[PDB]
Structure formats: structure tokens, C-alpha cells
């Protein structure tokens, strides 16, 4: 008729386990830590050919919807359009620097992203 | 740094019905010695030690 | 808008430097306004 759920844990983790059981847990996108493989897959498939195409591909994910509701969860300083655009440009520049330092992509005039051989071999396998 | 000084607060052992001259002189000296302490915004709070209370 | 247009990495650094310069100019204008308000209140 019913179901018992007895969670035996420490006293420090009892309040979090009691709060995350009856209240609905919100979803938070953590794609900012593992965006290099997604950027390499977008650059190897000729989808993100520049910075604007990469920003448009990153804006269609759940991280852009989570940053507009929780700015401090995504290490942002505001919910405005300029601060979010600057954070997206900084994330795209960090992804491009991580792709160029690992010899996975090529930056024509520091903005045009071209897939290299190592990036294509990483995105293929 | 983001907040403004609204004056100062002090306690008194006796219930004073009027303003204290030494506290007003100290407030005037703090307003004259600091350019950020404007007289229109800085006030003096007196907490008279009431018996069993505080006014 | 719907599709944001990002810039180059050096262009992102230049945009961050321009935003920092605009924030410094706004802080200098606010400090000048505060000094003018203090000079008006003192006189």
C-alpha cells in the first residue's frame, strides 16, 4: 500500500537528503566543464565554422536556459544580455584556445574555426 | 564602501529629555573632520537606559 | 537576440578591455558627481 525509504547517513548530510526528497530538485546544466568535445564535434562537422555559429550552437542548449534563471550557478555576474554575451564569448574563446593549444583546430584571423587532423581524429573515434 | 554613513549611535545611563551637548559637539566634530559625513544625512541616536527597557 | 554573434579571442579580450574602460569611465563620472554633490552640500 505504501513504500518506506529509510536513508541512514551522517548528521551533516541529513538536511540535504531531507530537502532533496520532498521538494523538487532543479536541473543545472554543467556543460561549461566539458564543452571542448562538443566544440570539436561542432567544428569537425562544419557546424560551428566561426564564433557566431559556435555561440548560436551553444545558445540552443540547456546551459543558455539555465544561465538566464541562475546566473551565479554558471559563474556569471548578471542576467543581462551584455554580461551573458561576454560570458559566452569568454567561454568560446577558452574553448578555441583549448582546441588550438592541443593542435585540434585552426584559427584563421583568430575567429574562423577550421577542423584539423587531430580534432577530426578525436571527433571521429 | 557601497553604504553611506547615516550618523552614529551611543548609549546614555540617564533618560535625557533634550539633546546632549557633548554628543552634538562630537557629531559636529565628526561632520567637520570627515567630508563624507554630511549634516543632512548623519544623525545621532541616543539609547537612554530605561529601567527594564531602552528608549 | 535568438542567435548571438560572438567574436574572436583577441576581439573578446579587446571587448573586455573596452567594457572595463567604460566601467572605469562610469566610476570616474560617478566620483565626479559625488564630489560635486559634496561641494554643493558643503557650501
Pairing of strands B7-12, A112-115: unpaired
Question: Per residue in A20-50, is it b (16+ CB within 10 Å) or e — as a string?
Answer: eeeeeeeeeeeeeeebbebbbbbbbeeebeb
Pairing of strands B43-48, B7-12: parallel
In three-state secondary structure terms, A67 is: helix
In three-state secondary structure terms, A113 is: strand
**Number of neighbouring beta carbons within 10 Å of residue A62:** 12
Does the CB of B2 have a partner CB in chain C at under 8 Å?
Answer: no
Q: How many CB pairs under 8 A join B and C?
A: 6
In three-state secondary structure terms, B45 is: strand
Q: What Rg value do the Cα atoms of chain B yield, rounded?
A: 13
**Number of neighbouring beta carbons within 10 Å of residue A64:** 17
Q: Which three cell numbers stand for residue A98?
A: 583549448
Strand partners, B2: none
Say if residues A48 and A59 touch (Cβ distance below 8 Å): no
Interatomic CA distance for residues A71 and A30, integer angstroms = 13
Cβ distance B36 to C38 less than 8 Å, yes or no, reads yes
Does the CB of C39 have a partner CB in chain A at under 8 Å?
Answer: no
Amino acid at each position: 500500500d505504501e513504500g518506506r525509504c529509510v536513508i541512514m547517513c551522517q548528521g551533516s548530510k541529513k538536511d540535504f537528503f531531507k530537502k532533496f526528497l520532498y521538494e523538487p530538485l532543479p536541473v543545472e546544466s554543467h556543460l561549461d566543464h566539458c564543452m571542448h568535445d562538443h566544440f570539436n564535434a561542432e567544428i569537425v562537422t562544419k557546424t560551428i565554422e566561426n564564433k557566431q555559429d559556435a555561440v548560436d550552437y551553444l545558445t540552443w542548449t540547456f546551459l543558455y536556459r539555465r544561465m538566464t534563471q541562475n546566473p551565479n550557478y554558471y559563474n556569471l555576474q548578471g542576467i543581462s544580455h551584455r554580461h551573458l554575451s561576454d560570458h559566452l564569448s569568454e567561454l568560446v574563446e577558452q574553448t578555441l584556445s583549448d582546441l588550438e593549444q592541443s593542435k585540434c583546430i585552426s584559427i584563421e584571423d583568430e575567429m574562423d574555426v577550421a577542423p584539423l587532423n587531430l580534432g577530426m581524429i578525436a571527433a571521429y573515434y | 564602501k557601497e553604504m553611506e554613513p547615516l550618523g552614529w549611535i551611543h548609549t546614555q545611563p540617564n533618560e535625557s529629555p533634550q539633546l546632549s551637548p557633548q554628543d552634538v559637539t562630537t557629531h559636529a566634530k565628526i561632520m567637520a573632520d570627515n567630508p563624507s559625513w554630511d549634516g543632512e544625512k548623519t544623525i545621532i541616536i541616543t539609547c537612554s537606559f530605561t529601567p527594564g527597557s531602552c528608549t | 537576440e535568438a542567435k548571438p554573434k560572438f567574436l574572436s579571442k583577441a576581439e573578446r579580450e579587446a571587448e573586455a578591455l573596452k567594457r572595463r574602460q567604460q566601467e572605469v569611465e562610469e566610476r570616474q563620472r560617478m566620483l565626479e558627481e559625488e564630489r560635486k554633490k559634496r561641494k554643493q552640500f558643503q557650501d
